[PDB]
Paper text:
Two distinct conformations of CmeB with space groups C2 (form I) and P1 (form II) were captured in two different forms of crystals. Although the conformations of the three monomers are different from each other, they are more similar to the “extrusion” form of AcrB. A channel for extrusion is found in each protomer of our form I structure. We therefore assigned the conformational state of these three protomers as the “extrusion” form. All of the extrusion protomers in both form I and form II crystals share very similar structural features, which include the conformation of transmembrane helices and position of side chains of residues within the proton-relay network such as D409 and D410 of TM4 and K935 of TM10. For the asymmetric CmeB trimer, the conformations of the three protomers display in such a way that either only one out of the three periplasmic clefts is open or all of these clefts are closed.
The Cme locus consists of three tandemly linked genes (cmeABC) encoding protein components of the tripartite Cme efflux pump (CmeA, CmeB, and CmeC), where all three components are absolutely required for substrate expulsion. Overall, CmeB adopts the fold of a typical hydrophobe-amphiphile efflux (HAE)-RND-type protein and forms a homotrimer, with its pseudo threefold symmetrical axis positioning perpendicular to the membrane surface. Each subunit of CmeB contains 12 transmembrane helices (TM1-TM12) and a large periplasmic domain created by two extracellular loops between TM1 and TM2, and between TM7 and TM8, respectively.
Residue numbers in the entry:
A (entry chain A): 546 to 941
B (entry chain C): 101 to 298
C (entry chain A): 51 to 199
D (entry chain A): 447 to 496
E (entry chain A): 249 to 397
F (entry chain C): 744 to 793
Write the structure that this text describes.
């Protein structure tokens, strides 16, 4: 029975704390990087009706064109806040609803659409599942990092414990630059402040000053309402005045060129890093996934990389094997006190053998029932030292 | 230490009032810090590879901030600078030949080393409702020293251009006049390593 | 404003990080630098740590790093404050009879509702998705612009 | 012995800090103060009432 | 609008409205909010660092009900995403679990001590103990919470 | 004055991943100061260089 406890120990996976069915769940949608907002509005509505006719969901609310993570406005991103029926009305757990919806949209090629439950402890993260950062200490570029991390997230989605691994690093965003012919700028005799202000007041936004009305304080911005087909059109009708009255168009000295870089760029703990996210495959534990991402990252990344955990996985890895010290302490002091109270070194030794039966029965039942080796469970094991001794003390 | 660092902080606001305007426009800063010196590193060239300022530049480029890294270090200070500069060395002789004052180079660098600008294509007002959205930038900020040299000072009629390179040299950091280190009768750059207060 | 993510990350984000690095009881920090000209750095402290102590602890080191910032950054400030990623509710406002469109509604929340909800205690943010307040917009019509020179 | 053996385990684990520590010490302290009082009631009030 | 752009020779004026459109705020076509298919402006209610999330949500729903009085036309509101309804519930179910457990022990005790007074006397431990440890938590600076319950 | 005898700070720029100040300074040979005051001109509001 003692060695049985050992084998049962290995057979039980580890977690930190359950991830309750809180009556809510969220959805992170991501259209191809180039996409315009109206494509995202389009794709959301499809997802939103398929979701809304799923069994357990009551309502669905959508922030289209918004990144739930970077809390900013991106047009190819969406975030849906789904609410479920009351617990005494649903025949389905959220961890089923989430898993069902995830299997459905596993191939929707018009956008990527992950479903997720809330975090276990209110502030530990934005969304449930796990979060880690692959940091590069090579000096490499975000286009090289991008490639490397892509190979990880690839292999990571093949493992049977992981599900919906992704990465927020997107360096494919199309970006046009306006190269300035500095020589043409002075030949045309132009004030360069006047030029950039003209650029902002038309294609971007130029902030002038503020006024006040309705007991509030509003901004005053200048933008262009012009209907410009392509970009080279716009530069032909937006003009700026030379120092000697001449009205030069931007088409002349500015020369548009199309490159492609990132839109957001993330560092984590002093290194440039890519932000990986995911959740465990249904029926696998938080620690079971964490063990699998890590195993993959040892086969997908080079020595110039490392990974750095966050939130409800940083805790779980930082507090790994803190179970023994608390448990071994209790046994010692229990034995010491009974040694004192009964004036014999061996009368406690015959109490202290009552505990292995308690941890056998606790591991046996959690393994029978598919439960896990989590904090609540380990705390119960501590209570069984005290409570099984109470049974032994009474005989001894 | 923190109850004092804030009881100071609180009184600073009251007296920012009567400061001369020229101080305000730079800010009066307060911090908890130690009167310490954990260690003092010394870097040098065994042979004559680097000069006495080639070493200072390498330290400033890599070493100095990589030691700001390591935790509990209040400061990693190479003894000889505050910030770090691209310096334009006006040659007043050739300045007077071509007809340029210092107030012309200050204005030329101030105007031609401008900042950025950013807009979006497919912006529902300024657009045609299309698939795809792009973002266009215009980078009027200079990046390499050779761009400062080609800051065009005066626009000559025969098409060509009197650029800044024709009136001054443009250097890059260093300029050792301020200080000089020695380690056992050898030219060396001292880095004093402070200890974070606490 | 105007700088790409790559430059903001290297000359705005890292100065602040190298300063804040070495904080009392900090476990890690994420940094996201954006093409929209915004840097966002988030320092995380050990479980059970004085929040308000870390906020002033951070705000200290920040004024030391404020001198290594680019001139454009100091110009409009660098602001630090304590805050939590714990969204507790989300209201929906809509026109049941299609009269208040989708932007007459937004206009009503800004003036009357968003302030009344920002009031109520314990709420940090209270934002409608999109605009920060809303601005008097002057829409340049380039046709009539060149028409009148 | 029952009261002691139950403070023997929980009093020392209510010194540990951390994510686990702050969770567990909610149990350790509530149990250790309760079973202690429960022993005092059994050593005084319970026989006296009987 | 009547900011005057150019002074003419008639004595008339070119004004900003003649080359631009001055509309006041309301800028969307950067975000759209949908509730169950319909247009709707979502207000997110964040929780400030350190605040009783349980009570603060009561206030939010209270003030929104007060602002309902002003809401013209078919302008109504929903709180489709309440995080505090789960707290309020899991607490109900832990008080359920408490009262249930309290009765199951009374039964296992009466069944073994056979008569009533034999069962009431040991039951006095349950108040005196449980009730007592709250005086301990108060002194040691603890809280009532799910883990305590 | 500051662009010649002292150092004048104009603005800054980013390069190599770092941010750098841009400083103007004259490198003229100072035989002394009362003659260095003779090669440094600054033009008047009416075009004359003084």
């Amino acid at each position: 029975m003692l060695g049985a406890i050992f084998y049962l120990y290995k057979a039980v996976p580890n977690s930190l704390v359950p991830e309750e069915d809180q009556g809510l769940m969220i959805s992170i949608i991501n259209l191809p990087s180039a996409s315009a907002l109206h494509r995202t509005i389009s794709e959301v509505d499809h997802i939103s009706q398929e979701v809304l006719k799923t069994n357990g969901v009551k309502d669905a609310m959508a922030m289209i064109g918004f990144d739930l993570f970077t809390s900013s406005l991106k047009e190819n991103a969406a975030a849906m806040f789904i609410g479920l029926q009351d617990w005494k009305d649903r025949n389905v757990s959220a961890d089923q609803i989430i898993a069902e919806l995830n299997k459905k949209f596993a191939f929707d090629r018009n956008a990527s659409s992950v479903f997720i439950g809330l975090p276990p402890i209110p502030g530990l993260s934005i969304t449930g599942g796990f979060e880690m950062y692959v940091q590069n200490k090579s000096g490499k570029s975000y286009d090289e990092i991008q490639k490397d991390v892509n190979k990880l997230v690839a292999a990571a989605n093949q493992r049977k414990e992981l599900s919906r691994v992704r990465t927020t690093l997107d360096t494919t965003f199309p970006q046009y630059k306006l190269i300035i012919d500095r020589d043409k700028l002075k030949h045309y005799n132009l004030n360069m402040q006047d030029v950039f202000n003209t650029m902002n007041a038309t294609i971007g936004t130029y902030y002038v000053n503020d006024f006040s009305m309705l007991g509030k304080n509003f901004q005053v911005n200048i933008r262009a309402k012009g209907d410009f087909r392509n970009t080279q059109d716009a530069l032909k009708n937006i003009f700026v005045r030379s120092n000697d009255g001449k009205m030069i168009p931007l088409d002349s000295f500015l020369t548009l060129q199309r490159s492609s870089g990132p839109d957001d760029v993330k560092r984590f703990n002093l290194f440039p890093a890519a932000q990986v996210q995911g959740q465990p495959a249904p029926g696998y534990t938080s620690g079971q996934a964490i063990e699998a991402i890590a195993q993959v990252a040892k086969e997908t990344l080079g020595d110039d990389y490392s990974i750095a955990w966050s939130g409800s996985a940083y805790q779980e890895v930082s507090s790994k094997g803190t179970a023994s010290y608390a448990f071994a302490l209790g046994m010692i002091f229990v034995f010491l006190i009974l040694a004192a109270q009964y004036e014999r070194w061996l009368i406690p030794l015959a109490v202290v053998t009552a505990v292995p039966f308690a941890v056998f029965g606790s591991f046996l039942l959690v393994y029978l029932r598919g439960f896990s080796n989590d904090i609540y469970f380990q705390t119960g094991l501590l209570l069984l030292i005290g409570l099984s001794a109470k049974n032994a003390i009474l005989i001894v | 230490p923190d109850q004092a660092t804030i009881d100071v902080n609180n009184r600073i606001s009251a007296a920012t009032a009567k400061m001369p305007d020229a101080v305000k426009k730079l800010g009066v800063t307060v911090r908890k810090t130690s009167s310490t010196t954990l260690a003092a590193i010394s870097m040098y060239s065994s042979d004559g590879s680097m000069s006495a300022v080639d070493v200072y530049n390498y330290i400033t480029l890599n070493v100095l901030d990589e030691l700001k890294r390591v935790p509990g270090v209040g400061d990693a200070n190479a003894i000889g600078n505050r910030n770090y500069s691209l310096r334009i060395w006006l040659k007043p002789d050739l300045l007077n030949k071509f007809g340029i004052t210092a107030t012309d180079v200050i204005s030329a660098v101030n105007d031609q080393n401008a900042q950025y600008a950013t807009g979006k294509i497919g912006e529902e007002p300024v657009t045609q409702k299309s698939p795809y959205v792009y973002s266009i930038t215009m980078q009027g900020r200079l990046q390499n020293p050779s761009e400062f040299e080609n800051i065009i000072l005066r626009t000559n009629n025969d098409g060509s251009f009197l650029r800044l390179k024709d009136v001054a040299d443009v250097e890059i950091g260093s300029q050792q006049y301020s200080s000089q280190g020695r380690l056992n009768g050898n030219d060396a750059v001292p880095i004093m390593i402070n200890l974070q207060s606490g | 404003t105007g700088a790409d993510a790559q430059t903001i990350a290297s000359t705005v984000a890292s100065p602040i990080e190298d300063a804040i690095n070495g904080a009392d009881n900090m476990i890690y920090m994420d940094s996201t630098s954006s093409s929209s000209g915004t840097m966002s750095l988030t320092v995380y402290f050990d479980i059970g740590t004085d929040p308000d102590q870390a906020t002033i602890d951070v705000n200290n080191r920040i004024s030391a790093a404020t001198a290594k910032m680019p001139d454009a950054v100091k110009k409009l400030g660098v602001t630090v404050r304590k805050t939590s990623s714990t969204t507790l509710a989300a209201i929906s406002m809509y026109s049941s009879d299609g009269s208040m469109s989708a932007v007459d509604v937004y206009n009503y929340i800004t003036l009357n509702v968003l302030d009344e909800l920002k009031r109520v205690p314990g709420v940090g943010d209270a934002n409608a998705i999109g605009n920060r307040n809303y601005s008097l917009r002057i829409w340049l019509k380039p046709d009539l612009l060149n028409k009148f020179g | 012995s029952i009261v002691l053996v139950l403070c023997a385990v929980f009093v020392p684990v209510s010194f540990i800090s951390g994510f686990v520590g702050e969770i567990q010490r909610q149990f350790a302290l509530t149990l250790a103060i309760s079973v202690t009082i429960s022993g005092f009631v059994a050593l005084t009030l319970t026989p006296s009432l009987c | 609008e009547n900011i005057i752009l150019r002074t003419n020779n008639d004595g008339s004026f070119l004004r900003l409205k003649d080359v631009a459109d001055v509309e006041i705020g309301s800028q969307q076509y950067s975000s759209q909010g949908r509730l169950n298919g319909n247009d709707a402006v979502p207000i997110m209610i964040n929780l400030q660092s350190g605040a009783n999330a349980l009570h603060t949500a009561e206030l939010v729903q209270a003030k929104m009900q007060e602002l309902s009085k002003n809401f013209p036309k078919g302008l109504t509101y929903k709180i489709p995403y309440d995080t505090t309804k789960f707290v309020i519930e899991s607490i109900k179910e832990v008080v359920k679990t408490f009262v249930e457990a309290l009765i199951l022990v009374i039964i296992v005790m009466y069944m073994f001590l056979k008569n009533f007074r034999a069962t009431l006397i040991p039951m006095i431990a349950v108040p005196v103990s449980l009730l007592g440890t709250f005086a301990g938590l108060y002194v040691l600076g603890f809280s009532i919470n799910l883990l305590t319950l």
